Structure formats: structure tokens, C-alpha cells
Write a protein that binds this ligand. Structure first.
Ligand SMILES: Nc1ncnc2c1ncn2[C@@H]1O[C@H](C[C@@H](N)CC[C@H](N)C(=O)O)[C@@H](O)[C@H]1O
Length: 260
């Protein structure tokens, strides 16, 4: 058993009050009041982020932890926060975004955010059974939280296997992907194997809630995986009892318009 397993048990033992206070303490949170109401009324001309994912991927790029370039695929795009971010980047030529959609899952939000015409959105697509194709950058933000850490470990394992399939099609492709439960043993095992063939490492974004152990793997960084995970687990364990609030920051506005 790991420190992350202990963090999970403590999280599940939280009352609802303890949960709401713990999940947001000390984290960066974009101010989404304007954006949420524009999306609610169905405004298509907007560059404000369609989701909290946009600022997360922007942080990774601004830090230099991901390379977004060429033909990008967004595996599990949801509303499309990562797709619209990538499409706004001048080094990106195209985005093929895929998400399952359907009951209980987010379909792409359709807006004119800068570069939207370079995105081909495909809803109704299960990426775990989709054949890979050529790509320069492979993104995947999949990993649904569960109180059951074994389920989360299995969901994480499926993502890594997906990235291995995309790397076998594209061995030189840049990769960034969510690792929902990085402390589980089958997850550490699969990340070690990926790192040995492809390089890379794990990083925590400051927008992630304390209620999730999610870390992001990218081929553009390095770092001992077990040490990365353990450092994060301790950071999470230390914020139990923290009553401070989130740090609120402005939401990303990418602008609107086509790119040609
Ligand atoms: N097997 C699957 N095939 C396709 N999409 C999936 C699958 N499993 C989960 N998803 C979707 O993957 C998405 C994961 C989200 N976290 C992505 C958020 C996105 N990066 C954003 O910035 O808005 C959800 O919308 C899920 O519905």
C-alpha cells in the first residue's frame, strides 16, 4: 500500500463539509461566471474557455512541459477545452478531436474560438477501440473519478495502453495524457514501461483539485515516476484540514476567428 492509497481512504472518510473545503483549498480556479452563462444561453461567438481544461493545458505549454505542434489528436475531448486551446496555437496545423458523448458525458461545445475551423470534432467515438492514425501530437485527458481506487487504477491503465498504441503508430509523436490514479501498482508498472521506451515524466497542474490525484504525463519532461507520485501524495495529505480557499484567477479568452 502507498501514500496515495492512504490519501484515497482519507478522502472517502470525509464528510460532505470536509470534502467541499478540502477539494478547493489552495488551488488555482478560473473565474467562469461570464463564460458559464454565455455557454448556457448558447452563444457561439466566444473565445472564453469552454471548460476548465483549457487553462490546465495552457499552463503545461506556458511552462514548457508540452510541445503542441503539427497534426494534433485530442483523445477524449469532451466539451473541447484542449481542442480549442491547441487550435489557437500557431504551430498547430490541425486537430482531430474525438469523444464518446451520450448519456452522462459531455459533447463538444461548438464555438468560433480562434482556430475552430482547424478542428474536426467527432462525437459518438470510443477511442479505446479506434484504430490509431498519423499524428505529431497526441493528447488524452481521459480518467473519470470514482470512490473506488481500483476502478480508477484500471481506468488509468486503459489510457496508458491507448497511448502505447498511438506511440506504436507514431513513435516520434509528442504525448501528453492524464494519469488519474498514478499511485496504483499496475499504473506505476505501465508508466515505467512507457518511460523506458519513450522518455517523459509526470507533473501536477495547480488547477487540479485536491480531491483528485491526477497528474499529467508528457514526453517533454523527465523525472523519477515513483518519487514524482510520492511527492504529490504528501502534498495532498498535508492539505487535509486546510481551510483556506481557492486562488481565483481570470479565465482564458483565446479570441475568435478562423485560422488559414
Ligand atoms: N472511451 C472513451 N472514448 C471517448 N471519449 C471518452 C472515453 N472515455 C471518456 N471519454 C470522454 O473523455 C472526456 C474526458 C474529459 N476530462 C476531457 C476534458 C477536456 N480535455 C476539456 O478540456 O474540456 C469526457 O468528456 C469523457 O466523456
Amino acid at each position: 500500500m502507498t501514500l496515495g492509497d492512504l490519501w484515497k481512504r482519507r478522502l472517502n472518510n470525509c464528510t460532505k463539509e470536509e470534502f467541499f473545503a478540502y477539494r478547493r483549498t489552495g488551488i488555482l480556479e478560473t473565474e467562469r461566471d461570464k463564460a458559464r452563462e454565455l455557454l448556457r444561453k448558447g452563444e457561439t461567438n466566444m473565445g472564453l474557455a469552454v471548460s476548465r481544461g483549457t487553462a490546465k493545458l495552457a499552463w503545461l505549454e506556458e511552462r514548457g512541459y508540452v510541445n503542441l505542434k503539427g497534426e494534433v489528436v485530442d483523445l477524449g475531448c469532451g466539451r473541447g477545452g484542449w481542442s480549442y486551446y491547441a487550435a489557437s496555437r500557431p504551430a498547430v496545423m490541425g486537430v482531430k478531436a474525438y469523444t464518446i458523448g451520450g448519456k452522462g458525458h459531455e459533447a463538444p461545445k461548438m464555438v468560433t474560438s480562434l482556430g475552430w475551423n482547424l478542428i474536426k470534432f467527432r462525437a459518438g467515438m470510443d477511442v479505446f477501440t479506434m484504430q490509431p492514425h498519423r499524428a505529431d501530437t497526441v493528447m488524452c485527458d481521459i480518467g473519470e473519478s470514482s470512490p473506488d481506487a481500483a476502478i480508477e487504477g484500471e481506468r488509468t491503465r486503459k489510457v496508458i495502453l491507448l497511448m502505447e498504441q498511438w506511440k506504436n503508430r507514431n513513435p516520434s509523436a509528442s504525448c501528453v495524457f492524464k494519469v488519474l490514479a498514478p499511485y496504483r501498482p499496475e499504473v506505476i508498472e505501465a508508466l515505467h514501461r512507457f518511460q523506458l521506451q519513450w522518455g517523459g515524466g509526470l507533473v501536477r497542474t495547480p488547477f487540479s483539485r485536491n480531491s483528485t490525484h491526477e497528474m499529467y504525463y508528457s514526453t517533454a519532461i523527465s523525472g523519477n515516476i515513483v518519487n514524482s507520485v510520492n511527492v504529490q501524495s504528501r502534498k495532498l495529505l498535508a492539505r487535509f484540514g486546510d481551510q483556506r480557499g481557492p486562488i481565483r484567477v481570470p479565465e482564458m479568452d483565446l479570441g475568435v476567428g478562423t485560422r488559414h
